[PDB]
């Protein structure tokens, strides 16, 4: 019954499956009675070369500015508030292992998930996920200027008490409010297998102003030149990628080694990598690729912070041997 | 020995073997006329006694399993084996026209073909559905499709040293020409080599031979034989033609 | 260059002259092991027991019709092994060099005379290599029945690898032969002993598909599909027995067809046929035994506007009321 | 007496499954609404999330590249996926497309006739259409839903719809009268009493508004390195191979079941692709069971016979080693 290695095919599925985040434009005094479409507009930009260059060909850079047809979005000279609608389906973690070659590791992972299910049943992580819902980080750069950010979180035809998103800071997580705890309790239940699915529809109103600029999710252009800001279009309207929304709702890792010195949550990844900051925050030790080999292959009791991490990457998936 | 034309309209072949070595896409026409000999083999297994002499192919709709890239070149898709040998697949909404001669041609033998063809596969591909099986009297009784004629005169009167060079020159002149697989050329003398499908048949190692064919419209085609395929077996040169 | 390639082929701790001394020994050690063929049966299925293959240089060259391996370019011969351990002659065939051994050139004679002499019987050896002969047909070679006269003859199809190499090169040179579909469906562990599939693991063959407006798009699938009104007639109070007796619910009857008819026009060639079995079954829906006197059927969703000849679509309109709704569908969809 | 197996024996598939064609509808109006569901494209960024030694991690974390990934998702207005597929079944006695020795052919005809008057392909039909009833042909599309309704139509008769979220995937049920009638149809058309049976199955699944529909991934075998789904007639669908493998998971007789308790699809050496180790290595296989049936005439336990005449219903190249 001893465990030697990790399976050749060890693949978890997403237990937090988000839809795309479809954009709409509305007025804030009549948000509940308004829903105008937000369309991607097309604009010509002229190449302002701001990259570094020695004083050899800067005159050639200023001589021939090649224009680029960039897709950018302005709302309307009438609307005043972004309406994001996006859905999330939370599925039980146990019924998400997409492949496990060995069966002994499978029953070891099922016993280990149940061990966590007994002590803190996915309530800490759920509260943190719904705290990531609450502060409205869905808006990555759209959040940068607003007066009221209001997120309504509908759970199965039950419109919950609406959230103020600027009162909740980006760097601290709240365990007190009643709505966040009961929504997190439903998500904790869904994680269990006590409930087999939960559809959560979240609508965010951000009042950036009148005729201001939105910032949708960019898309990779075709490789045969045509370099320009091609934004995402979902149903003849702007939208954000479910990968951005999941990375927004995956920034729950405060239990990283260099915390007391950086004091900023990073998004959950296999070696603790933040692409905008650099210097991977969880290298060597505190890395699933050693922690679950210390938890399943060997058999000690990790502390609850590393236990919080090591089963928080299990909503994400993608491993191997 | 009455001769009649039986039209099998909108036959939807799913996953026919598009790969034919040097030719991927249109399957070997030997598949499409071995469908006729299988549909006659199982009919003379019953009490129908039909001898099918020729079959015309009308390619109404097509889809190749695969994806188009950024450039335009397709990429073929294959099932995952339970090492992948070269293979590719095609779906074909195509209609057959069967020249049938024998005791009698009637609507009851159309019902017998209706019963018999639902246990058959064409070029290794299952049949989803069929529209209608009807005896036709003239070219008008044929729906809008595009028949595959053998334009061997384009390949023969083509500039080049070798006939491949002629085929490359031929596809570089007219665009509606498609290189199609027709028959099998012998590579050895016949005999009872061991390990056969059916030990009593004489067995001959072969190599696929290829030609160039064209697509002719329904109400532009002249005559019906001009679009009917037939089997001819010269010594060591098995092949299906248009004559 | 060529001697430099021979020295770079074997780079051990042993000296370079000893490297040539052992490499030429392998050269006159592996020609008896490897064979020469134009067709290898392992190209169809890798798991083909035994080296099954054939040589087609014997057949003549004809300009009468069709295409066969003999009737083609067919310039480089295809060297074939069985085991990779007793095989390394392709360094002296490719390093083209195969043309140099084919054209009676004596510069390769000078290179081999510099190496370990013995060029002439090595030339004989790769030109009297044992020609691959077929002696067995296995379940993995494709065996197909084909008639001769009135009796079927078993035809085992041995795949043409030489033709494959010829077309791949010529098509690249063709650049725009229109028919240029690439099969990238073979991996590096090709135990097929053929040299030419080792040179090109991803062959370039013709794309022979019907002209590019017969390809089924989403629209074509939608054209074949037909629409049905959502109206649940089995209750729909105001419609008793199956007949639109009440004129109050009439405007819904135009509006449902106009909603599933707007921008749904379909030429007659793609429209459903008016089979008599549908009105027969709709008469058998509730009694009747014929179409009732003064009531006559109407596809709630106009046939032209993508309608089906189903049971759940058709209705009985009054004659004056049918005149009203047919003036409505004449005006709205602009037939 | 026979001495071996034939040299060109090849059965064909007795349960041909056509390609599924995905549609998007609303549950309230699902018997009329049928909007096409297309394969949209998105740009993902490489996460670079494999095991790699802790010295070099700064290289492949700070240089990501975008990959165009095809992703299928429902509309905001529609909240159900409609999987429509077809089935064509033919009798197995006729599925022997190729055979070499007539003594062997007489022996396998006699053994199939011996099973055909013993159970008569009933339990096989119960399990094959039971996999339709559990809706395992929605492999990862069923991990969360509300009412997954499977409606099965034979010829022109629409058999009662089956709520798939009441039948466990690991427990095969043999009490349902709809399942019994439909299994009698597949059993009689598998016996040879009929010569063809078409079965058209339409399944509605409530995955939710705007959620993700997962279709079959096309094997690219080309580099891209992107997720590329199957676009059938401009619409999503499953590779029919997957559909037949989903309906094929009927094997509850593989050695050592009391410990594992989950059904696996039928292959030759019992190789399912979830568990890497083959479940049926030796003295329980296909090849050492027809040898233990035909070559040495001896009655086998009926679970073994159910297995071997399940893979005989599959088809493949059951032949000699040569």
Author numbering:
A (entry chain B): 10 to 330
B (entry chain H): 1 to 82, 95 to 255
C (entry chain G): 1 to 95, 102 to 341
D (entry chain A): 11 to 233, 235 to 333
Copy out sentences from the published article reporting this entry, exactly as the authors wrote them.
Recently, a newly identified type I-F variant, known as the Cas8-HNH system, was discovered to lack the Cas3 helicase-nuclease gene in its CRISPR loci. Instead, an HNH nuclease domain is naturally fused with one of the Cascade backbone components, Cas8, generating double-strand breaks in target DNA molecules. To elucidate the molecular mechanisms of target DNA cleavage by the type I-F Cas8-HNH system, we reconstituted the Cascade complex and obtained multiple cryo-EM structures representing the target-free, partial R-loop, full R-loop and ssDNA-bound states.
Utilizing single-particle cryo-electron microscopy, we solved the structure of the Cascade-crRNA ribonucleoprotein (RNP) complex at a resolution of 3.6 Å. The 3′-stem loop of crRNA is capped by Cas6 protein at the head of the RNP complex, while the Cas5 subunit, along with the N-terminal domain (NTD) of Cas8-HNH protein, recognizes the 5′-handle of the crRNA, masking the tail of the backbone. The C-terminal HNH domain of Cas8-HNH protein, which occupies the HB domain of Cas8 protein in the canonical type I-F system, is located at the center of the G-shaped surveillance complex. Analysis of the protein surface potential showed a small positively charged binding groove on the HNH domain, which may be responsible for the target DNA binding. In particular, Asp252 of the HNH domain forms salt bridges with Arg125 on the Cas6 protein. Ser324 and Tyr301 of the HNH domain are hydrogen bonded with the Gln136 and Lys133 from Cas6 protein, respectively. Apart from the polar interactions, Val299 of the HNH domain makes hydrophobic contact with Phe48 of Cas6.
